[PDB]
Write an enzyme that holds these catalytic residues in place. Structure first.
Site, PDB file in Angstrom:
ATOM      1  N   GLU A  63       0.820  -1.218   0.000  1.00 53.24           N
ATOM      2  CA  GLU A  63       0.000   0.000   0.000  1.00 53.24           C
ATOM      3  C   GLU A  63       0.862   1.280   0.000  1.00 53.24           C
ATOM      4  O   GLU A  63       1.956   1.317   0.581  1.00 53.24           O
ATOM      5  CB  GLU A  63      -0.992  -0.012   1.176  1.00 53.24           C
ATOM      6  CG  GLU A  63      -1.932   1.195   1.267  1.00 53.24           C
ATOM      7  CD  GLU A  63      -3.032   1.043   2.334  1.00 53.24           C
ATOM      8  OE1 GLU A  63      -3.213  -0.059   2.897  1.00 53.24           O
ATOM      9  OE2 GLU A  63      -3.735   2.038   2.611  1.00 53.24           O
ATOM     10  N   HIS A  93      -9.914   1.962   0.162  1.00 49.57           N
ATOM     11  CA  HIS A  93     -10.762   2.831   0.978  1.00 49.57           C
ATOM     12  C   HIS A  93     -10.689   4.219   0.374  1.00 49.57           C
ATOM     13  O   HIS A  93      -9.690   4.584  -0.252  1.00 49.57           O
ATOM     14  CB  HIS A  93     -10.342   2.831   2.463  1.00 49.57           C
ATOM     15  CG  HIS A  93     -10.069   1.472   3.021  1.00 49.57           C
ATOM     16  ND1 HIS A  93      -9.643   1.292   4.330  1.00 49.57           N
ATOM     17  CD2 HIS A  93     -10.136   0.231   2.487  1.00 49.57           C
ATOM     18  CE1 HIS A  93      -9.470   0.013   4.562  1.00 49.57           C
ATOM     19  NE2 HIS A  93      -9.763  -0.660   3.453  1.00 49.57           N
ATOM     20  N   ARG A 135     -14.484  -4.918  13.139  1.00 50.67           N
ATOM     21  CA  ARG A 135     -13.721  -5.929  12.336  1.00 50.67           C
ATOM     22  C   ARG A 135     -13.539  -5.606  10.822  1.00 50.67           C
ATOM     23  O   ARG A 135     -12.602  -6.101  10.163  1.00 50.67           O
ATOM     24  CB  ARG A 135     -14.300  -7.360  12.553  1.00 50.67           C
ATOM     25  CG  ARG A 135     -13.858  -8.489  11.547  1.00 50.67           C
ATOM     26  CD  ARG A 135     -14.623  -8.413  10.196  1.00 50.67           C
ATOM     27  NE  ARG A 135     -14.721  -9.674   9.444  1.00 50.67           N
ATOM     28  CZ  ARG A 135     -15.513  -9.852   8.380  1.00 50.67           C
ATOM     29  NH1 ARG A 135     -16.274  -8.858   7.936  1.00 50.67           N
ATOM     30  NH2 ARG A 135     -15.555 -11.022   7.756  1.00 50.67           N
TER      31      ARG A 135
HETATM   32  N1  LIG Z   1      -9.457  -4.815   1.376  1.00 55.74           N
HETATM   33  C1  LIG Z   1      -8.959  -5.165   2.702  1.00 55.74           C
HETATM   34  C2  LIG Z   1      -7.479  -4.766   2.836  1.00 55.74           C
HETATM   35  C3  LIG Z   1      -6.728  -5.398   4.018  1.00 55.74           C
HETATM   36  C4  LIG Z   1      -5.799  -4.409   4.718  1.00 55.74           C
HETATM   37  O1  LIG Z   1      -5.221  -3.525   4.036  1.00 55.74           O
HETATM   38  O2  LIG Z   1      -5.667  -4.507   5.959  1.00 55.74           O
HETATM   39  C5  LIG Z   1      -9.819  -4.466   3.761  1.00 55.74           C
HETATM   40  O3  LIG Z   1     -10.748  -3.728   3.423  1.00 55.74           O
HETATM   41  O4  LIG Z   1      -9.621  -4.617   4.970  1.00 55.74           O
HETATM   42 MG   LIG Z   2      -8.035   2.528   6.379  1.00 53.86          MG
HETATM   43 MG   LIG Z   3      -4.934  -0.707   4.383  1.00 49.62          MG
END
Ligand SMILES: N[C@@H](CCC(=O)O)C(=O)O
Ligand SMILES: [Mg+2]
Ligand SMILES: [Mg+2]
Ligand SMILES: Nc1ncnc2c1ncn2[C@@H]1O[C@H](COP(=O)(O)OP(=O)(O)O)[C@@H](O)[C@H]1O
Ligand SMILES: Nc1ncnc2c1ncn2[C@@H]1O[C@H](COP(=O)(O)OP(=O)(O)O)[C@@H](O)[C@H]1O
Ligand SMILES: N[C@@H](CCC(=O)O)C(=O)O
Ligand SMILES: [Mg+2]
Ligand SMILES: [Mg+2]
Lengths: 443, 443
Positions: B195, B244, B315
């Protein structure tokens, strides 16, 4: 002390840092890190960077709790290894809750607190000389760690000569630019096994050069077409890799263990301290020894500790005291291994140290006669108790101990037990190639 | 502003550009481009460049229709990667019908057309701080992606050490030179997963930033012999990449979401905005997660937003509100994956927020209790719906929604579905190895 924010923002401009790796350390002791471009130093040194704190919990995290990164300016380091657009800079940082308080679950704070409490009885420093052992393995075309060793040397041998690999040479030469202080390094007992002992230093700066170590090693070795690992017992039948821990207490700039007159040149401080390490040994192992695997090394045979007791100079004693007294007065704990978390090994070791000076604990008679040799009978006549043999045993032990379970807190402790109870769960449900080849045909 | 035509003509001489990419997005977020020699810079700047606009439809194009390309001089950029002759540059172009009208089909227009709506309602800027995740796979002999991940890292780890490959770090650096303002970057939950987080920016400034990113990424990853893909879930039973979207409605240059005088410090607008995002949630999922694969990630377990609501910490809640506050008062929408077309993502997220605002909708009970930990009927207690589980489901919902449609417009909506009802067909008519694995001998 060591540095100031003006020395830094000047140094980053000077050296041409273009990347900042704000490193920390999760609970299993792994080297966490959130990295920002150098353009983002201000925000960083302001203590504003927010990262998901639930990470400190490792594979057993559930929900995300935002947390802050407070760097320690006296941990700044410019990596020799350049990027094609400038160099990279590191920063060890403590984790703080969103509000203001420090995050209780941070192994580094946790060692500050137990260390705070050290000075609550009047001692000035808590110094550490670690003797952390590691292995070098070869790599195949695919970057895939094999299981052949970079050599076939043995104890104190001349490891790969200065015409070639010498990963260990070059590893130590790269650390010294980094303003490290290495005592010496020698080939260890098994082929491919190496060691680099450290010049001692206050715990925190020690548990930070103990991480940095692991990183420069796994870095430098990779560079020469090798894989480096601190796994306690890589290969069945060969030496394990243990990380001893030379410990000493100062008061008023002076070493407390030393006492000219008293027995052995050990004050009531040094004497009592010991007694508590011994009381609490069997327990606190589950921390100094986090993994399923370590207990394969803590099997009597390869000069590893398997018994609680201290000597003048025995075979493999669990608590040695090295020849030297005075200031270099020290107690060696030779059961810790490089898989241990240095913050949680020093938090807990520190514990049983002070739980023994607190309640004035009575150091038991030191076994000077070969501890191994004894039958499984006279083994009890001297009250020489073995250690836990499987991560489970180690965890029921520690799970109970009132003192250990306070030197970690309610956050750090409660989590740890879960990760390890999951870990164990995986080992014991598994069906290894052994079970199958010992059972499929006999039964 | 950023660049006058006089300004740019200067830098293309000085910096020796010899090529130019008139760059734009098709309907599915794919980065398209019509390239030209620098000898043809005047023609594009004067907006006279004709290309086939039917390409914007992707594969569902039929009849060839001539269209015009108008560059945004504020998006001029040189790529820090030289060709044998000279440098290469580019612009993000907007698409216009043969008669200087915007093309109702361009995703970049429809975000302008929808950001316009925000001004009719009374706001100033709609900011965005993407958190786009991605995987790097190894390349075999042929130059083809394999299934080997680039490393073995895990959550917030030190991703590849600074000695060797390091694609991640190298992409953060590179993008810094390109006037990109990067916030941070870590290693993600799965091995080879990464990321790099963005500084908030206007919608279309960021979407321009999100596309370019994908391009730089794939470009450097190729350079290190890797394969960078933005697939929502390229590997079963391995955490999946998401993206996100931290959103924050401004008005009068001030965060219209903050307000010490409200619940949790959320302005009566922030409340309303959340109200409408929830009203429309099941409906816009067919656009923020536009692939037959997006939904193999929305399976409960590997932490992802299966369910619809907004709390303090859970969660994997659909809507979140991070710790941060003040100007930093935002509405994180955690279900968006990197499979979405930026301009069409925001087109529908914006609309929903505006339907809540405009229509004084009331935000429901923010389920502060963990939701994952509830049974389908024990979950029915509260007003908690999961989202579509197949692209089939997600599209029928989307269609039955009045506001969503009116948020993409005739042309987009029409072609979008057309194309997406084809993917499902291609996929429900397929016969996968699973189907054989399971039934061919069973039945
Ligand atoms: N798409 C996953 C990514 C996992 C992460 O980056 O922790 C989530 O929404 O949690
Ligand atoms: Mg986030
Ligand atoms: Mg993340
Ligand atoms: N007071 C102390 N506390 C902790 N470790 C120590 C102390 N003194 C020495 N050590 C450790 O012991 C090792 C060698 O130290 P040194 O003082 O040279 O011992 P000697 O006197 O036996 O030569 C090093 O690995 C060092 O870290
Ligand atoms: N006003 C805003 N609107 C939208 N997104 C934002 C806003 N402010 C910050 N973000 C985003 O939220 C994420 C977390 O950043 P953080 O450093 O915690 O922000 P801050 O320091 O402003 O509280 C970033 O990826 C950033 O892009
Ligand atoms: N792992 C052994 C090594 C033996 C030695 O180095 O003396 C101990 O601990
Ligand atoms: Mg040794
Ligand atoms: Mg020794």
């Amino acid at each position: 002390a060591k540095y100031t924010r003006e020395d830094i923002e000047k140094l980053v401009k000077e050296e041409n840092v273009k990347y900042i790796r704000l490193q920390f350390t999760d609970i299993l002791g792994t080297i966490k890190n959130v990295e920002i471009p150098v353009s983002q130093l201000g925000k960083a040194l302001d203590n504003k960077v927010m990262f998901d704190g639930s990470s400190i919990e490792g594979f057993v995290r559930i929900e995300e709790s935002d947390m802050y990164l407070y760097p320690d300016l006296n941990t700044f380091v410019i990596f020799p290894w350049t990027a094609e657009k400038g160099k990279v800079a590191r920063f060890i940082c403590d984790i703080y809750n969103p509000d203001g308080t420090p995050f209780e679950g941070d192994p580094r704070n946790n060692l500050k607190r137990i260390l705070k409490e050290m000075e609550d009885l009047g001692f000035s420093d808590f110094n550490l000389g670690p003797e952390p052992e590691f292995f070098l393995f070869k790599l195949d075309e695919k970057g895939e760690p094999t299981l052949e060793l970079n050599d076939k040397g043995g104890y104190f041998d001349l490891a790969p000569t200065d015409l070639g690999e010498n990963c260990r040479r070059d590893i130590v030469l790269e650390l010294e630019e980094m303003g490290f202080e290495i005592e010496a390094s020698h080939h260890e007992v098994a082929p491919g096994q190496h060691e680099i002992d450290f010049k001692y230093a206050g715990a925190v700066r020690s548990c930070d050069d103990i991480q940095t170590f692991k990183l420069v090693v796994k870095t430098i070795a990779r560079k020469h077409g090798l894989h480096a690992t601190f796994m306690p017992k890589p290969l069945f039948g060969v030496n394990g890799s243990g990380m001893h821990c030379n410990l000493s207490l100062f008061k008023n700039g002076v070493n407390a263990f030393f006492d000219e007159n008293a027995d052995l040149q050990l004050s009531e401080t040094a004497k009592h301290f010991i007694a508590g390490i011994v009381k609490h040994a069997t327990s606190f192992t589950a921390v100094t020894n986090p993994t399923v695997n370590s207990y394969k090394r803590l099997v009597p045979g390869y000069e590893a500790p398997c018994y609680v007791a201290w000597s003048a100079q025995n075979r493999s004693p669990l608590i040695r005291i090295p020849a030297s007294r005075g200031i270099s007065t020290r107690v060696e704990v030779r059961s810790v291994d490089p898989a241990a978390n240095p913050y949680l090994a020093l938090s807990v070791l520190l514990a049983a140290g002070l739980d023994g000076i607190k309640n004035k604990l009575e150091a038991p008679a030191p076994i000077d006669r070969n501890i191994y040799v004894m039958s499984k009978e006279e083994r009890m006549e001297n009250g020489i108790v073995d250690l836990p043999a499987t991560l489970a045993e180690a965890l029921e032990e520690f799970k109970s101990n009132e003192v250990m379970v306070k030197a970690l807190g309610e956050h750090l402790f409660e989590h740890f037990i879960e990760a390890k109870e999951i870990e164990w769960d995986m080992f014991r449900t598994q069906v290894h190639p052994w079970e199958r080849e010992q059972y499929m045909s006999q039964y």
